[PDB]
Design a protein around this ligand. Structure first.
Ligand code: HEC
Length: 99
């Protein structure tokens, strides 16, 4: 934006980003408390499939919903921090990763 800079018709360059990967997003937002799918804050609440499913957290979209209003000691993630597409990726990684 110099004095001589011209108007543009082009728009939306800002949002032309790659889709982030689930593993990286997990490492960034979750692995601190859930390393290797465990739980360092509440030891009984691991991400092991049977345990997630005991509370009805069965699918990718169950994960992506759970993080919006989770249990004590876990922060809630709203949609500015973890947009819907990113929530799905994190759900995918949880389901693909922790038996
Ligand atoms: C620590 C500050 C946490 C961060 C960051 C994340 N989680 Fe978490 N998680 C944490 C606690 C203390 C608990 C137990 C809450 C309770 O009910 O007592 C959990 C639980 C989960 C679960 C399972 C819920 C259940 O079985 O009832 C899941 C599926 C889960 N957490 C996923 C998850 C994801 C995907 C995160 C990053 C986006 C994440 N957690 C962050 C502690 C913390």
């Amino acid at each position: 934006a110099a004095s001589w800079s011209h108007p543009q018709f082009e728009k939306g360059a800002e949002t032309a980003v790659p889709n982030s990967g689930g593993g990286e997003l997990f490492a960034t937002h979750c692995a601190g408390c859930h390393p290797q799918g465990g739980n360092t804050v509440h030891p009984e609440k691991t991400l092991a499939r049977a345990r997630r499913e005991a509370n009805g957290i069965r699918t990718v979209r169950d994960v992506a919903a759970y993080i919006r209003n989770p249990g004590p000691g876990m922060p809630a993630f709203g949609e500015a921090m973890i947009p819907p597409a990113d929530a799905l990726k994190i759900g995918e990684y949880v389901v693909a990763s922790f038996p």
